Amino acid sequence: VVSDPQSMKVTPIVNPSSYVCNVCNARFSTMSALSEHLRSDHRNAIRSFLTAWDDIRILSPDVSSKSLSAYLDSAVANGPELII
Amino acid sequence: LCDALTLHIRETYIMLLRSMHQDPTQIVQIVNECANNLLNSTIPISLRP
Amino acid sequence: NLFNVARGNLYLVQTATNGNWSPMAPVAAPPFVRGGPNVRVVGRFGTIVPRPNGLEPQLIDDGNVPRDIAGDWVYPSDVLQVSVAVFRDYVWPMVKAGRTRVLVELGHYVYTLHYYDPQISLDEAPILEEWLSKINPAGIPPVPFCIPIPQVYPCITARRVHYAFTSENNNDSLFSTNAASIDTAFGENAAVSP
């Protein structure tokens, strides 16, 4: 390796700064943490979304909505215990 | 071994669950038409038996 | 162009010039205009569907059909604002590898010029990835253009992988190429316009 200025500098094609997920786009700073998300998730109803305009994760409200208050003689309707 | 009376129930209960099955690959068209094409999504699922 | 506003659309291809490069004044006709031979235009959402088992990811065109990334694409400026990270993760490496060429259709735009010594080599993408990370849905930054500083002596000249150039001749405020010198050698021969 001879460090000369006349040497064609090429940026990497895929990004190591943003190793995107294989079956998702859950980005991280290290792909070692990415190998455990696919080991657990890609093997409720809506767990999350990922927005292309703000790059944040929008999550569902919690299933423990009993702690949430009920307003004026009307209860928060939850899903039934179907899968047993 | 299983009593046929319980097997008649646990098979009828699972006909109830397969009756209410929504094809998860069609959730994309549900979200679009319920948003009047203001918010599109792409939901990847793995088609399993 | 005298008021730092450039007309015409924008091009992002891979180009490794051993010699001269001019983003403001393109020497040839621009490739893949809108509606050309198999040139595909992205629809409103800027949406990419992932595909299973080693297939290439598909991009939804203007006619709401998934099309493959490797080819010639057209971007409205509004579509690029809502689809920033989807541009930057999927179709922008296919520009870096040269397997696709995108057009960024925006009518008029403020432009910032970068000037570099063509002795030292340079890659335009980290200067241009910075332009992509600063695009909000609100607005876009002034578009960067790396222009080689025109030399007075015919030197050996490093390759540069250049990316951004425009369609219309926007080199309307240049006025000189080596003013105090005697004769330009490497860069453009832009003498003072009578």
Left (φ > 0), alpha (ψ -120 to 50) or beta: where does B3 sit? beta
What number of residues does chain C have?
A: 194
CB–CB contact A25 C89 (8 Å): yes
| DSSP of C25-66 | S-SSPPSS-TT-TT-EEB-SS--EE--STTPPPEEEBTTS-E
- The residue whose two tokens read 């927005």 is A51
Q: Which subunits have 3 or more CB–CB pairs within 8 Å of chain B?
A: A, C
Phi, psi of A62 (to 5 degrees): -70, 155
The residue assigned the tokens 């040139």 is C39
What gap in Å lies between CA C149 and CA C119, rounded to an integer? Answer: 10
Tell whether C155 lies on the interface with A, counting CB pairs under 8 A.
no
User: Containing H/E element for C112?
Assistant: strand C108-116
**B25–chain C nearest CA distance, Å:** 12
Do the strands C160-166 and C122-123 form a parallel or antiparallel pair, or are they unpaired?
parallel
Neighbours of C87 (CB within 10 A): 25
Q: Residues C110, C130: contact at Cβ < 8 Å?
A: no
- Residue that has been written with the tokens 């109830």 in this structure: B16
Kindly give, in sequence order, each residue whose CB lies less than 8 Å from that of residue C64, ignoring residues fewer than 6 positions away.
C43
Q: Containing H/E element for A65?
A: none
C14 CB neighbours in chain A (<8 A) are none
- Quote the CA–CA distance of A3 and A17 in Å, as a whole number: 24
Task: Give the whole-angstrom CA distance, residue C178 versus residue C156.
Answer: 18
- Minimum CA–CA partner of B47 in chain A: A43
User: Cβ of C107 under 8 Å from any chain A Cβ?
Assistant: no
Asked whether C161 and C16 are in contact (CB, 8 A), the reply is yes
Method: cryo-EM
Amino acid letter, A46: I
Strands C40-41 and C10-17: unpaired
A-B contacts at Cβ under 8 angstroms: 6
Instruction: Give chain B's length.
Output: 49
Phi, psi of C150 (to 5 degrees): -70, 125
- Beta-carbon count within 10 A of C194 CB: 3
Query: Closest residue of B to C43, CA-based?
Result: B40
Q: Report the residue of C45, C61, C79 to disrupt the B interface, i.e. the one with the largest count of B CBs within 10 Å.
A: C45
Sort out which chain B residues have CB atoms less than 8 A from A83's CB and list them.
Answer: 17
Tell which residue, C20, C16, C81, C69, has the closest CA to residue C40. Answer: C69
Identity of the amino acid at C149? I
Beta carbons within 10 angstroms of residue C80's beta carbon: 22
- Cα distance between residue A8 and residue C122, in whole Å: 7
Do you know the residue count of chain A?
84
> Please, which residues 18-47 of chain A have a Cβ atom closer than 8 Å to chain C?
18, 20, 23, 25
Letter string b/e over residues C142-168, b meaning 16 or more CB atoms within 10 A of that residue's CB: ebbbbbbebbeeeeebbbbbbbbbbbe
Contact B46 A49 (CB under 8 A): no
- Nearest Cβ partner of B17 from A42, A49, A82? A82
Cβ pair C43, C63 in contact under 8 A = yes
Distance CA C58, CA C10 (A): 23
Q: The tokens 């050698």 sit on which residue?
A: C185
Return the amino acid letter for C192. Answer: V
Nearest-5° Cα angle at C139, B28 to A14: 65
| Torsions phi, psi for A36 (to 5 deg) | -95, -20
Burial C103-118 (b: 16+ CB within 10 A, else e): bbbbeebebeeeeeeb
Residue C76: enclosing H or E segment and its boundaries? strand C72-76
* Contact across the interface for B40 and C52, Cβ inside 8 Å: no
Q: Using CA atoms, how far apart are residues A43 and B46, in angstroms rounded to an integer?
A: 9
Reported resolution, Å: 3.4
Sign of CA dihedral C17, C22, C26, C28: negative
Cβ pair C48:B44 closer than 8 A: no
Nearest-by-CA chain B residue for A48: B43
